[PDB]
Amino acid sequence: ANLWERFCNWVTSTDNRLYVGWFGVIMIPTLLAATICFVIAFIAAPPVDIDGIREPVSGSLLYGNNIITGAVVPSSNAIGLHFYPIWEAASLDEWLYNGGPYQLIIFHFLLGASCYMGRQWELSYRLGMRPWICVAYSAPLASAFAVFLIYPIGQGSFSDGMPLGISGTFNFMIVFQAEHNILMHPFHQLGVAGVFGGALFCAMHGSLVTSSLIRETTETESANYGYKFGQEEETYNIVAAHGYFGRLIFQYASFNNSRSLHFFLAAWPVVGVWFAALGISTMAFNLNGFNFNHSVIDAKGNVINTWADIINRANLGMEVMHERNAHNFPLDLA
Amino acid sequence: ATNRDQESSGFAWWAGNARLINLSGKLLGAHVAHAGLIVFWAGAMTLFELAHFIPEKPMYEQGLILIPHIATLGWGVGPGGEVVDTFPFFVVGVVHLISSAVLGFGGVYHAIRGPETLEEYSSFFGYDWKDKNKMTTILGFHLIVLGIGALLLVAKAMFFGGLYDTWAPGGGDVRVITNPTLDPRVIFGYLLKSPFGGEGWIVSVNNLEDVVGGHIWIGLICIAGGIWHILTTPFGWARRAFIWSGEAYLSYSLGALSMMGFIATCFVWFNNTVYPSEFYGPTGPEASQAQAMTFLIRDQKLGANVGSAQGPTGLGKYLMRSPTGEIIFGGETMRFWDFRGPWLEPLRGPNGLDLNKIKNDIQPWQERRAAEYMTHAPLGSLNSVGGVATEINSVNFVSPRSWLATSHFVLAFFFLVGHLWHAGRARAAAAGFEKGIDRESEPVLSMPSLD
Amino acid sequence: KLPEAYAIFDPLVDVLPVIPVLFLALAFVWQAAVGFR
Amino acid sequence: VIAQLTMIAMIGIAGPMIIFLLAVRRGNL
Amino acid sequence: ERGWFDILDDWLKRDRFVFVGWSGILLFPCAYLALGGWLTGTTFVTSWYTHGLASSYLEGCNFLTVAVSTPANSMGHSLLLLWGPEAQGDFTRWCQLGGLWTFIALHGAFGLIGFMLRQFEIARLVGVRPYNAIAFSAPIAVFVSVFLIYPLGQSSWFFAPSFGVAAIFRFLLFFQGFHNWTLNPFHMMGVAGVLGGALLCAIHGATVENTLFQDGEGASTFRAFNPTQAEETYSMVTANRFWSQIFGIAFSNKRWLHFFMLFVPVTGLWMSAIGVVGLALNLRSYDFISQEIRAAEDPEFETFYTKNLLLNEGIRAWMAPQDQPHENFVFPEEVLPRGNAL
Amino acid sequence: TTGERPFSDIITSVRYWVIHSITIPALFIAGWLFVSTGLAYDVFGTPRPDSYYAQEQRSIPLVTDRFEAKQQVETFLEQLK
Amino acid sequence: SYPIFTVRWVAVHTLAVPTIFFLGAIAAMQFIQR
Amino acid sequence: SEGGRIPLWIVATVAGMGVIVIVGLFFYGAYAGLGSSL
Amino acid sequence: MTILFQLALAALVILSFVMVIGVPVAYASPQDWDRSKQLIFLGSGLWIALVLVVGVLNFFVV
Ligand code: CLA
Ligand code: CLA
Ligand code: CLA
Ligand code: CLA
Ligand code: CLA
Ligand SMILES: CC1=C(/C=C/C(C)=C/C=C/C(C)=C/C=C/C=C(C)/C=C/C=C(C)/C=C/C2=C(C)CCCC2(C)C)C(C)(C)CCC1
Ligand SMILES: CC1=C(/C=C/C(C)=C/C=C/C(C)=C/C=C/C=C(C)/C=C/C=C(C)/C=C/C2=C(C)CCCC2(C)C)C(C)(C)CCC1
Ligand SMILES: CC1=C(/C=C/C(C)=C/C=C/C(C)=C/C=C/C=C(C)/C=C/C=C(C)/C=C/C2=C(C)CCCC2(C)C)C(C)(C)CCC1
Ligand SMILES: CC1=C(/C=C/C(C)=C/C=C/C(C)=C/C=C/C=C(C)/C=C/C=C(C)/C=C/C2=C(C)CCCC2(C)C)C(C)(C)CCC1
Ligand code: OEX
Ligand SMILES: [Ca+2]
Ligand SMILES: [Cl-]
Ligand SMILES: [Cl-]
Ligand SMILES: [Fe+2]
Ligand SMILES: [Mg+2]
């Protein structure tokens, strides 16, 4: 074998402790750059003029933040969707003021995480597996694309991308509610059904398999020792599990087929989260939640408030207060 | 009934169309019948739009997406995009609707009556997915067809009345394109432009000369490529790079359509040339700029000196500099300074927005347009209540730009998913493990431990 | 509006665009008839 | 309104009628 | 021994389409009434006298905006029994006073007890370990903390969640503006357990479906499984190698994997419940004191934390007069907090 | 199976549909009339569109006393003239 | 061959009977004008 | 009486069409009368 | 010409409905295919004729 042939054999080797592969050739450097920049920025970055109004917001630990308040702050509204790599700045000091780290991080991250998804297909192929784990990962990935790329595109600025920080995330959520009434949007509602249901079914499946473990141990040892890695025989009794759950509800509401059950476990959260991602990605173009403001009117024409109108009052509070020095004109159009 | 249950086909009802992979006749029917559905919708939706259409309201106040496509081609409209004749819309709708019956007829025939496979019937129409030469030949036919389609657009623009030109001197109007851009430096230059702000890759195309010239190129490229693929078979390197199966080819096309979907989303969101704001409403960037313009006009009429007016932050309230110094509108719309539109451009000088032009040259038609666009911003609820999320019920409006961007993002996204699903499946099926791991030949069991 | 001669077909025209959706639903009726075999 | 609901009734039944007629006649479903 | 008790026991535990049991005697009436009460209220019943809201299909609400709303604040924590001193046996007045709220909450609570008893009862009869019932303690801790303990620490049932889609959304936004509930590490642990549970659900389902053994000839692989089969339907060994190489670690023990799937969302929900118990008393994680001291002295110091409090202050001022009508709030235009222009 | 008649047997039988082509429409119509006669408003105490406010009133009839809450509502209802 | 009035029968009708009544009520509501 | 007389695919199609009609009416009602905002 | 037009179009609609049900049923029916094939041929030629008739008469009624 020549050098290229050998290199290819190593890259695609099924024997590396962590699989590299061709997607990994892009994933490794991009994820390392994003990680390193993030860590350094989160600790040490100076304040960033997120809203382009010369009002710098401090995100880093050394500049007065704790783990909860800290963030890498989105790039300046003055930049908008302009590409702002380090070399476009006159200095690192300028780059930092304008939120250059945010762009470097999210672009390397999105590239790296897309390659992470490809890499999941890639290894499944090398191991002779079925290929669709990567399709499940497309759900959180799509969600990351929605908040870091698609929303900024629709609104015309990376300053409206989700901040890389715990409190910045909450800021993004509250402002999103004000501007899109996301709670009243059916795609976010499907998302909630996806994650509440995902958690429910996770607990359900956990509890049912755990409930029907076949006795292989004594009381002075963990029942976990009753299963040995790679054993051929199933470790629980699915017939007893189905016997239980089918009586809890009724026979035909319970799965007796493990393949069907596990498919449902994959599908429910993944589809819901795809809708969550699509909610963000379509509210990115301002097709917003249901608006029933003043929908109910009496015989004279008096407005009779519903809970929708109370939501509206909360939303107004968010709207009027957010970015309190950034608006000069009466309508918030992006 | 051949292959029409799970036992014989290996595919459950919910994967029923996979039963068609190797039945070229029935599969032709599926495809032709489906092309029928697309043509049916195009026709029926147009007639529906026309029946609901009030000529003196803007199209974008009327939930129209198809009439705007016809109007952009220069049919049925005059100066400013005003509707002068609805008959071209009627023709487009009827002719599609009639054509769909024909396609539906052929589809139904092939699907349930005609020969199930075409190979024994004809060597020309029959095909084996794994026959690389036959695959590239059929691909070749379709590329020629597509090239002719692109030249049909060129024909309309140059020889059959022209296209609607929002940029036309003295105001938007239908205009014949006599000098299409042929220079490959300009045409392919778009393809190498950054997709980021102020650049916008192909989405930045801003004049009909470039649009028409692009389609001349694309028409010729597609016909040349089609001939190429009829006359050649795939080279060795291509043979070793791809999976050669029906499902693989589907996956490649799903990937391509996904890409196109996202591009179309950005096209309708930002571009106001091939999506004239007269027909589709203002872009998000456009309406935000139009707001700044509106209040600059209002306050300047009241006596404000808008050049020297310092806002609360220290930046100009109405006017400020972009990061490269151009004079731009201020407030949040600073992000939208790359916006360009016929109503704004007359105020633009070498250095950006010109203060002397602003002070002296703003015409009533500009005030009207800015007010119109500001109050038809592409924001609205799912139940079509126009405006911000906290707005009260009153205005029944969601911009066609929002409808078209959101729908196409959703479609493009699910098509990326379909690409991954089918590409991963095509690989596994080709290698022979799509149904699971062979218990007596589990690959991992022959591999050394990781530790 | 449609040209006046066709006005009587307004109610029909209002319904036509939804017909494609009926084809998807039809696939399910058909499959139900053959027992989703 | 009556005219619109009659149309979607004839159009709506067309599909299920095709299947029904074929099932009665032992057609090639 | 063969008395009436044992004969009743026999009938209760008959193997039928819908199992009954001794637990059924509690469960079925309480669940039926809770659900029936909700459907009845959302269909026909107003919130005009308790909230100044329409809340039923009868009044013109849709599925998103209908609710059975909490009683007026002036009711305090009244049980609001139909025969109690407020309604005095008058069914109509009882509806107008919010009696259906305590009706649904209380039958709901006893119904949940019945459901968990049902889980125990069936597990015992079938001979399985009662981990499903144990896991259900999380839903119960949430229901009890949010619908009972929270309003009990507040002024009245008025501030419990109203049973409705939009009403619940209002409850979320109230907790943001008033409690800064996103900042609370007990809610944060809840979020991690819910999202972590959804993650585990998806990843485990996908891993099993993608490490399946070929056990049939069909390209649709569901039929190639038999409930009574002894063998694992998928390869733990291949799954383990995949994740070890992709992510760095992998499950190797199926019993642990499935216990963890119980542990994560169950623990999350229990954590969120503890935070809500604090909120019953306004014992919030509202502020970081060091942040406030700095920001008060330094008008250039700004974080996403200070930004979110401004949002909260807007929520409170803008929503309180209509959301808390018993307070008779009148906030003149001039006092309302607003940024520039908006 | 648990001994009850299969649902698919029941709902594909003529007798089921003889019974239920009566009982289902009967229930639906009874529900309809419960609303159309106005009885629903009376049973539950829900305001009709003309009964939220007196002609010139813009204040909500909020219950403000726990033990005289019944009388308060009755007083609010009287004031609708 | 099969019983008619079972626990299952009762359970089914406790739900189905009010559901149809309610659907008729809600249908009627769609014609209420202020 | 006899199970099977009315094919299950017809029962499903008719019941399904019934559900579409009633839900459709509810959506019509969102635009007319109470709750229409008008 | 409005009498000719308005009924030719009604006849177009009516025949389309007949064809929409008739063509697939015929295609999938076991017996009477000989009688069916000619009727489908007839219906198709007549459908095409009616389209052209409506198309021409359009301009004498609009
Ligand atoms: C665009 C939608 C679409 C199209 C074009 C097709 C096409 C096809 N499918 Mg798929 N399918 C679909 C969606 C579609 N399918 C969906 C959504 C599902 C899930 C429910 C399925 C599940 C499925 C299964 C399980 C199978 C198919 C099969 C087939 C083929 C044979 C059908 C047959 O034998 O009919 C028999 C039915 C009849 C004779 C009844 C009448 C049907 C006709 C076509 C209706 C025409 C109505 C129309 C209004 C008439 C207009 C005529 C006018 C122009 C004159 C056919 C090529 C079969 C196949 O693969 O065989 C090898 C097969 O087994 N499909
Ligand atoms: C590109 C697709 C597209 C776009 C952008 C539009 C856009 C528009 N249409 Mg048109 N139309 C379409 C396709 C489209 N339509 C189709 C397929 C039909 C046949 C049913 C119609 C028939 C039609 C009629 C009859 C009317 C419109 C009208 C309208 C306007 C208002 C829409 C509205 O209120 O939505 C309401 C929103 C919804 C109903 C929600 C849709 C959500 C879907 C179900 C989610 C899809 C998710 C995904 C694809 C599924 C994947 C599942 C996953 C698990 C794989 C708007 C301009 C109205 C108008 O104003 O005309 C002048 C009008 O009356 N349309
Ligand atoms: C992609 C579309 C397509 C393809 C590849 C085929 C292919 C085939 N067809 Mg089907 N069919 C179609 C669509 C298609 N058909 C449509 C739309 C209809 C309704 C009109 C039919 C109805 C039909 C019937 C009734 C029969 C066939 C038959 C055949 C076979 C022989 C055809 C032949 O000898 O032509 C030789 C070439 C000619 C006769 C000259 C073609 C003239 C064309 C129309 C000129 C216009 C071309 C133009 C570019 C089209 C643009 C359309 C675009 C706008 C959509 C062959 C397998 C036969 C069969 O399968 O035998 C058992 C047969 O009996 N077809
Ligand atoms: C539907 C359109 C279509 C499709 C599906 C194909 C399919 C095929 N072509 Mg054909 N071709 C077409 C149209 C098409 N062609 C046209 C219009 C022309 C005239 C220009 C040609 C001229 C042509 C030639 C000369 C050759 C092919 C070849 C091939 C084969 C391999 C192609 C390949 O490896 O791509 C993958 C692409 C590459 C490996 C190029 C480099 C990839 C870069 C890095 C991607 C950059 C793009 C990126 C996504 C961003 C886009 C913007 C960018 C421009 C900045 C395959 C059968 C080969 C063949 O075997 O001939 C028989 C071959 O030699 N085609
Ligand atoms: C197991 C089923 C069950 C359970 C646990 C409950 C529980 C409850 N109901 Mg519900 N209810 C049920 C079934 C049930 N109900 C049924 C089947 C109906 C239809 C009739 C109702 C209709 C209903 C209504 C309309 C209301 C309730 C209400 C209540 C609450 C107060 C009840 C109370 O104070 O009783 C007190 C009585 C007991 C606890 C029984 C004690 C039995 C002892 C051990 C025997 C001693 C009695 C003795 C012989 C009498 C001698 C007295 C003498 C000195 C005069 C509580 C949540 C109220 C509520 O929800 O308000 C918000 C309310 O208004 N229920
Ligand atoms: C294969 C298949 C399928 C499918 C199918 C299809 C897809 C089809 C189609 C189809 C089609 C696609 C069709 C069609 C049609 C059409 C028509 C039939 C037409 C017509 C028209 C007319 C008649 C007209 C008229 C008019 C005029 C002229 C003017 C104005 C007015 C009016 C509108 C009146 C399914 C899924 C079921 C499944 C099984 C298989
Ligand atoms: C019309 C127009 C125009 C133009 C245009 C054009 C001229 C174009 C184009 C175009 C083009 C010219 C394109 C393209 C492309 C391409 C692609 C899309 C690709 C791809 C690829 C791939 C997919 C690959 C793959 C792979 C790899 C990478 C590795 C190995 C393996 C494989 C093979 C798998 C303009 C703008 C001026 C204006 C307006 C209009
Ligand atoms: C243009 C035109 C036309 C056309 C037509 C057509 C083309 C039609 C069609 C049609 C169709 C195409 C139809 C259909 C249908 C359908 C349906 C109606 C359905 C359904 C369904 C359902 C309801 C389902 C259900 C179900 C099942 C079966 C199973 C499982 C479960 C469920 C429940 C999901 C005419 C002639 C008028 C004339 C003039 C113009
Ligand atoms: C409260 C009360 C009571 C009771 C009551 C009850 C128990 C009731 C019931 C009731 C009921 C039991 C009702 C109901 C109902 C219902 C309904 C109203 C329904 C519905 C529905 C629907 C509408 C559906 C739909 C849907 C869905 C959800 C799914 C998917 C699709 C769809 C969209 C189809 C008593 C007398 C003791 C006493 C006092 C109080
Ligand atoms: O940057 Mn961040 O948040 Ca989207 O809306 Mn306009 O811009 Mn600002 O206000 Mn609202
Ligand atoms: Ca009235
Ligand atoms: Cl903010
Ligand atoms: Cl602004
Ligand atoms: Fe499992
Ligand atoms: Mg209504």
Instruction: Please name the residues in contact with E85: beta carbons below 8 A apart, sequence gap of 6 or more.
Output: F67
Provide the β-strand partners of residue B174.
B164
Contact criterion met (CB < 8 Å) for B12 and E222: yes
CA distance G17 to B43: 45
Pair B4, B11: CB distance under 8 Å:
no
Pair B117, B64: CB distance under 8 Å:
no
Instruction: Please name the residues in contact with F49: beta carbons below 8 A apart, sequence gap of 6 or more.
Output: A298, A299, G32, G34, H34
Longest dimension (CA), chain H: 52
How many other CB atoms are there within 10 angstroms of residue A107's CB atom?
A: 18
Cα separations in angstroms, B339 against A44, B168, B200, B290: 36, 18, 11, 10
* CA-closest candidate to residue B369, choices B172, B83, B141, B137: B172
- The DSSP 8-state label assigned to residue B134 in this structure reads H
CA distance A274 to B409: 12
* CA-closest candidate to residue C10, choices B50, E15, A184: B50
Phi and psi at residue G3, in whole multiples of 5°? Answer: -70, 155
Phi and psi at residue B3, in whole multiples of 5°? Answer: 70, 30
CA distance E290 to E306: 12
Pair A312, E313: CB distance under 8 Å:
no
Distance from CA of I52 to the nearest CA of C (A): 16
Q: Which residues on chain H place their C-beta less than 8 Å from a C-beta of chain G?
A: 22, 25-26, 28-29, 32-34
CA distance A119 to A28: 11
Instruction: Please name the residues in contact with B252: beta carbons below 8 A apart, sequence gap of 6 or more.
Output: B423
CA distance B357 to B348: 8
CA distance A315 to H14: 43
Q: Which residue has the tokens 């110094």?
A: B325
Task: Give me the number of domains chain I comprises.
Answer: 1
Taking the CA of A295 as reference, the closest ligand is: 15
CA distance E86 to E80: 7
- The string of DSSP codes covering A164-203 is EEHHHHHHHHHHHHHHH-GGG-HHHHHHHHHHHHHHHHHH
CA distance A155 to A176: 12
Cα separations in angstroms, B167 against B209, B367, E84, E195: 11, 18, 76, 51
Ligand 7 pocket residue status of B217, Cβ below 6 Å? yes
Contact criterion met (CB < 8 Å) for B437 and E237: no
Nearest-atom index, ligand 5, CA of E80 = 62
Start-to-end C-alpha separation, chain G: 55
CA dihedral E273, E275, E280, E286 (to 10 degrees): -160
Distance from CA of E122 to the nearest CA of F (A): 16
Pair E74, F69: CB distance under 8 Å:
yes
Instruction: Please name the residues in contact with D21: beta carbons below 8 A apart, sequence gap of 6 or more.
Output: D27, I21, I25
Q: Which residue has the tokens 């399910």?
A: C28
CA distance B322 to B326: 5
3-state DSSP call for residue E270? helix
Start-to-end C-alpha separation, chain I: 11
Pair A118, E233: CB distance under 8 Å:
no
CA distance B254 to B420: 9
Residues in H 18-37 with any Cβ partner in A closer than 8 A: 34-37
Contact criterion met (CB < 8 Å) for A334 and B420: no
Provide the β-strand partners of residue E231.
A233
Q: Which two tokens stand for residue B132?
A: 């690389």
CA distance E324 to E159: 9
Pair E54, A304: CB distance under 8 Å:
yes
Distance from CA of A186 to the nearest CA of G (A): 22
Contacts of D4 in chain C (CB under 8 A): 11, 14-15
Burial (CB count within 10 angstroms: exposed 0-12, middle 13-18, buried 19+), residue B129: middle
One of 1.10.1060.10, 3.40.50.720, 3.50.40.10, 6.10.250.2070 is the CATH number of H1-38, namely 6.10.250.2070
Q: How far is ligand 4, taken at its centre, from the CA of residue B149, in Å?
A: 20
Burial (CB count within 10 angstroms: exposed 0-12, middle 13-18, buried 19+), residue F37: exposed
Q: Measured in whole angstroms, how far is the alpha carbon of residue A144 from the centre of its chain?
A: 5
Q: Which two tokens stand for residue C9?
A: 């077909």
- Report strand pairing: B163-165 vs B173-175: antiparallel
Angle at the Cα of A199 from the Cα atoms of A198 and A203, rounded to 5 degrees:
115
CA distance B106 to B116: 14
CA distance E213 to E211: 7
CA distance B143 to A54: 53
Q: Which two tokens stand for residue E305?
A: 């934390």
Phi and psi at residue A66, in whole multiples of 5°? Answer: -110, -175
3-state DSSP call for residue B163? strand
3-state DSSP call for residue A233? strand
CA distance A40 to A31: 14
Q: Which two tokens stand for residue E50?
A: 């308790």
Q: Which two tokens stand for residue B211?
A: 């649009």
Q: Measured in whole angstroms, how far is the alpha carbon of residue D4 from the centre of its chain?
A: 17
3-class secondary structure for A103-169?
HHHHHHHHHHHHHHHHHHHHHHHHCCCCCCHHHHHHHHHHHHHHHHHHHHHHHCCHHHCCCEEHHHH
- The string of DSSP codes covering E226-260 is -TT--B-SB-HHHHHHHHHHHTS-----HHHHHHH
Residue B80 gets the label, from left (phi > 0), alpha (psi -120 to 50) or beta, of left
Pair A165, A71: CB distance under 8 Å:
yes
3-state DSSP call for residue B442? coil
Here the CATH number for the domain that contains residue I29 is 1.10.287.740
Phi and psi at residue C34, in whole multiples of 5°? Answer: -100, 15
When computed from its CA atoms, the radius of gyration of chain D, rounded to whole angstroms, is 12
Contact criterion met (CB < 8 Å) for B48 and C17: yes
CA distance F38 to A168: 52
* CA-closest candidate to residue A36, choices A140, A117, A108, A141: A108
Cα separations in angstroms, C3 against A51, B62, B272, F12, I61: 53, 19, 31, 49, 9
List all chains that touch chain D, counting a touch as 3 or more CB pairs closer than 8 Å: C, H, I
CA distance B143 to B223: 6
Distance from CA of E191 to the nearest CA of B (A): 26
Residue with CA closest to ligand 2 atom 52: B414
Pair E276, E138: CB distance under 8 Å:
no
Contact criterion met (CB < 8 Å) for E62 and H33: no
- Give exposure, A290-314, as e/b (b: 16+ Cβ within 10 Å): bbbbbbbbbeeeebbbbbbbbbbbb
CA dihedral B245, B251, B256, B260 (to 10 degrees): 150
Pair E116, E137: CB distance under 8 Å:
yes
- Domain extent listing, chain F: 1-80
Contacts of H36 in chain A (CB under 8 A): 295
Q: At what angle are helices B87-108 and I2-28 packed, to 10 degrees?
A: 20
Q: Which residues in B90-243 belong to E strands, given as ranges? A: 163-165, 173-175
Angle at the Cα of A312 from the Cα atoms of A306 and A315, rounded to 5 degrees:
155
Pair A240, E128: CB distance under 8 Å:
yes
Residue A45 gets the label, from left (phi > 0), alpha (psi -120 to 50) or beta, of beta
Cα separations in angstroms, E270 against A15, A210, E274: 42, 20, 7
Phi and psi at residue I22, in whole multiples of 5°? Answer: -70, -40
CA distance B6 to B13: 7
CA distance H14 to H33: 29
Ligand 8 pocket residue status of C28, Cβ below 6 Å? yes
Instruction: Please name the residues in contact with A163: beta carbons below 8 A apart, sequence gap of 6 or more.
Output: A50, A59, A71, A72, A73, A74, A102, A169, A171, A172, E304
- Give exposure, E119-138, as e/b (b: 16+ Cβ within 10 Å): bbbbbeebebbbbbbbbbeb
Phi and psi at residue C2, in whole multiples of 5°? Answer: -70, 155
Ligand 4 pocket residue status of B331, Cβ below 6 Å? no
The letter for the amino acid at E166 is: A
Experimental method: X-ray
Ligand 3, residues B39, B110, B127, B143: which to mutate, most atoms within 8 A of Cβ?
B110
- Residue range(s) defining the domain that contains residue I1: 1-62
Q: How far is ligand 2, taken at its centre, from the CA of residue A173, in Å?
A: 28
CA distance B415 to I42: 42
Ligand 7 pocket residue status of B216, Cβ below 6 Å? no
Q: How far is ligand 6, taken at its centre, from the CA of residue B40, in Å?
A: 6
How many other CB atoms are there within 10 angstroms of residue B128's CB atom?
A: 12
- The DSSP 8-state label assigned to residue F51 in this structure reads S
Instruction: Please name the residues in contact with C7: beta carbons below 8 A apart, sequence gap of 6 or more.
Output: C1
Angle at the Cα of A164 from the Cα atoms of A158 and A167, rounded to 5 degrees:
110
Pair B369, B290: CB distance under 8 Å:
yes
* CA-closest candidate to residue F35, choices F26, F44, F24, F25: F44
- Report strand pairing: A287-288 vs B380-381: parallel
Contact criterion met (CB < 8 Å) for A277 and B413: yes
Closest CB to E32 among G6, G8, G14:
G14
Contacts of E217 in chain B (CB under 8 A): 10, 435
The letter for the amino acid at B62 is: Q
The letter for the amino acid at B311 is: G
Provide the β-strand partners of residue B385.
B396
Q: Which residue has the tokens 């118990």?
A: E277
How many other CB atoms are there within 10 angstroms of residue B233's CB atom?
A: 14
Topology of domain F1-80 in CATH is 1.20.5
Burial (CB count within 10 angstroms: exposed 0-12, middle 13-18, buried 19+), residue A187: buried
Q: Measured in whole angstroms, how far is the alpha carbon of residue F1 from the centre of its chain?
A: 39
Instruction: Please name the residues in contact with A18: beta carbons below 8 A apart, sequence gap of 6 or more.
Output: E245, E246, E248
Pair E190, E268: CB distance under 8 Å:
yes
Pair A76, A100: CB distance under 8 Å:
no
3-state DSSP call for residue B149? helix
Contacts of H8 in chain C (CB under 8 A): 32
Q: Measured in whole angstroms, how far is the alpha carbon of residue B151 from the centre of its chain?
A: 18
Distance from CA of B265 to the nearest CA of E (A): 30
User: Where is A288: in which H helix or E strand?
Assistant: strand A287-288
CA distance B440 to B244: 28
Asked if G32 reaches chain H (Cβ–Cβ under 8 Å), the answer is yes
* CA-closest candidate to residue B324, choices B353, B354, B351: B351
Start-to-end C-alpha separation, chain A: 58
Pair A278, B409: CB distance under 8 Å:
yes
List all chains that touch chain G, counting a touch as 3 or more CB pairs closer than 8 Å: A, E, F, H
On the CB side of E68, how many CA atoms lie within 13 Å of its CA?
A: 24
Contact criterion met (CB < 8 Å) for A296 and H38: no
Q: Which two tokens stand for residue E35?
A: 């659900």
CA dihedral E24, E25, E28, E34 (to 10 degrees): -130
CA distance A190 to A143: 14
CA distance C35 to B1: 14
For each of the domains in chain B, give its residue range(s) and CATH number, in order of start: 4-281+378-451 (no CATH), 282-377 (1.10.10.670)
